[PDB]
Design a protein around this nucleic acid. Structure first.
Length: 465
RNA sequence: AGCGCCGCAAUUCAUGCUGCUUGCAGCCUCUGAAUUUUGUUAAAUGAGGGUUAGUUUGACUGUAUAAAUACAGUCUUGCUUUCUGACCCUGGUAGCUGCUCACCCUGAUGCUGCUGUCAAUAGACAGGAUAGGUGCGCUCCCAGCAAUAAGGGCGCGGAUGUACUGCUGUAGUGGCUACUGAAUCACCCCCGAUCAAGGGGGAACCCUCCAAAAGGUGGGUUGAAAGGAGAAGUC
DNA sequence: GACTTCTCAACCA
DNA sequence: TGGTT
């Protein structure tokens, strides 16, 4: 729900063949037909015009009796997986447009487990943390993960054991694992697409559930949402012999949420409202950080892009060179060519993650519960209004010199992934416990002044509300 | 010459250091910032393609420390990525299949550019990435080609011709499929596995100890970092 | 390749 | 293993 981990799954050949023949021959045709029938179904204009869609129209388009001769021999959870995927696809598509869709790949569609369980674990004679699936209990796999993520799988197994020992008095809403994805991965070679295709499982986990105090905050979130749900729908709709069972089940979840788990106890990170960390993005320096406390109007510390990256500062120049080279070949090959997928490296993402981690670390060191960021939409102007301000520094009043230098500079220095940087800073701040706020970056001034004024303006906007 | 980056150096500061008054004073030592000029100063940046389930970036528990952190003991697994090294190769057999070409001017976000011997533009062989230029790189500059960016001139040989064509070969430059040539590594080597599986032998350095000097003992090390993944679209 | 949406069940049979 | 909200 907040973090995703992954691990390869290694198992019998018969198990792999059976799972593939169940996926690519019985499941993916099912998802494709569900998408096609949803597209062909009437009221599509009403759905798209109104936005969103009714909750159970895919399940009600199962009314053509999914159990057709072509779809026989499938566990129910896999039917639910097909329903999940199709509903998510159409939900996202109908939200995007404010038309028939297909699969944007050649590999079989993944398997989605919106439920916590259906991933019953084990530990074979050799000690490996194996896993099988609901309906596919005969399919015993073996988890191959990294030591950087092993403790999550062991937490999964031990949470399942904890609930089992108490005869199901620990709520499955506090389980660390939320969803699982059985995604087939591409494999270079030739042969059957289950000996030359690797299966990888993705576990969705909430990092707050690792500790105990975060488990309490998720507890209180669950309690508030459940109480609002029951007090909003119980009071009306006159219920029936079906949604009264839902009321009873939500009440049992509410009571089961309090019989908590023995959990690591790392105290919650509490910041200060006074201290805001403002990260001002720019074109010459892609990010500059200031740690300003607004009560005393002083600034604790400025950090340039070199200081944040430390021993990874060479990655910035590597990425700038790679961006220049990629843009050069993309323009050069735009003459109706088709070269390779050049620059497949995720170096930009790597530097983004390094910057986000360093910024969050600097936020923690000064105990700041608010990191201030600029809006993405505004940014398309700032990089346009900064380069010209650079030209006026070198050729003041020489307009032709301004344009020439601006063109050469834009050739040498491009925009640097200002969206993924904000996204990863948000991810790391949410993981640590730091609130991300939006500010108004001044279009004029040095990067340090821009960062300080960004954070100060964010605080001044906050004080009103 | 231009631009970007690296470092260097005198220059001014704090984001840094001291001092008590806890925001004021001075210094530049560490850490950094700022259009301040330089590149024999040692100086940091930078190499064409490919090679490891490769090592470290871990979790739990207990500690001093307000945390941040450092030590201790248990466990450990290999997923997806970014560097840093070292290594291997600058290919072969075939099939197919793109774009372009009468000739002449301008030359593009065009192509090519290493070393030493043979040799005629063209290439063979042995090496091989400190592969044209500045410290390094460029959509910049140099040289050659330029039909394979646009543009312009004028030929023949065909057209009922009014329309459009051929001047195209043992052509140039690319793409794909299948087979096999080398590396399948993280201090080095041999053996074996690649849906699991490690086992063994060695080299330098440091430490505990026996010590009687010498010699011997066991232990540890021989690069690190990051992650939220699926699915569908927008430019 | 850089942005834009959506999901991130929990008890009971 | 399988099921309604």
């Amino acid at each position: 729900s907040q973090i995703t981990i992954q691990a390869r799954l290694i198992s019998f050949e018969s198990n792999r063949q059976q799972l593939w023949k169940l996926m690519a021959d019985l499941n993916t045709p099912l998802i494709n037909e569900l998408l096609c029938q949803l597209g062909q179904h009437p009221d599509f204009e009403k759905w798209q015009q109104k936005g969103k869609l009714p909750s159970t129209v895919v399940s009600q388009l199962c009314q053509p009796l999914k159990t057709d001769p072509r779809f026989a021999g499938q566990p129910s959870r896999l039917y639910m997986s097909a329903i999940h995927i199709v509903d998510y696809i159409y939900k996202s598509w109908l939200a995007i447009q404010k038309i028939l869709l297909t699969r944007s790949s050649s590999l079989p569609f993944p398997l989605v487990f919106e439920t916590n369980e259906d991933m019953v674990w084990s530990k074979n004679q050799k000690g490996r943390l194996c896993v099988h699936f609901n309906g596919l209990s005969d399919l015993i796999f073996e988890v191959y993960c990294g030591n950087r993520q092993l403790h999550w799988f062991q937490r999964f197994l031990e949470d399942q054991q904890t609930k089992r020992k108490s005869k199901n008095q620990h709520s499955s809403g506090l389980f660390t694992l939320r969803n699982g994805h059985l995604v087939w991965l591409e494999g270079e070679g030739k042969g059957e697409p289950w000996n030359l295709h690797h299966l990888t499982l993705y576990c969705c986990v909430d990092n707050r559930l690792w500790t105990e105090e975060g488990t309490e905050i998720v507890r209180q979130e669950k309690a508030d949402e459940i109480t609002k749900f029951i007090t909003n729908m119980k009071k009306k709709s006159d219920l029936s012999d079906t949604q009264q069972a839902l009321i009873q089940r939500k009440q049992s979840t509410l009571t089961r949420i309090n019989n908590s788990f023995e959990r690591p106890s790392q105290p919650l990170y509490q910041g200060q409202s006074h201290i805001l960390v403002g990260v001002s993005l720019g074109l010459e320096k892609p990010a500059t950080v200031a740690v300003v406390d607004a009560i005393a109007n002083k600034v604790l510390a400025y950090r340039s892009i070199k200081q944040l990256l430390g021993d990874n500062y060479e990655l910035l120049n590597r990425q700038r060179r790679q961006q220049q080279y990629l843009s050069h070949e993309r323009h050069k090959a735009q003459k109706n060519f088709s070269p390779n997928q050049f620059g497949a490296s995720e170096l930009g993402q790597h530097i983004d993650r390094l910057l986000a981690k360093a910024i969050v670390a600097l936020a923690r060191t000064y105990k700041a519960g608010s990191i201030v960021l600029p809006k993405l939409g505004d940014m398309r102007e700032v990089v346009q209004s900064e380069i010209q301000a650079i030209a006026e520094q070198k050729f003041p009043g020489y307009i032709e010199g301004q344009q020439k230098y601006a063109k050469q500079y834009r050739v040498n220095v491009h925009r640097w992934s200002y969206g993924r940087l904000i996204q990863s800073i948000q991810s790391k701040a949410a993981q640590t416990g730091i609130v991300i706020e939006e500010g108004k970056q001044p279009i004029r001034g040095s990067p340090h002044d821009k960062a300080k004024e960004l954070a100060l303006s964010a605080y001044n906007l906050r004080l009103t509300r």
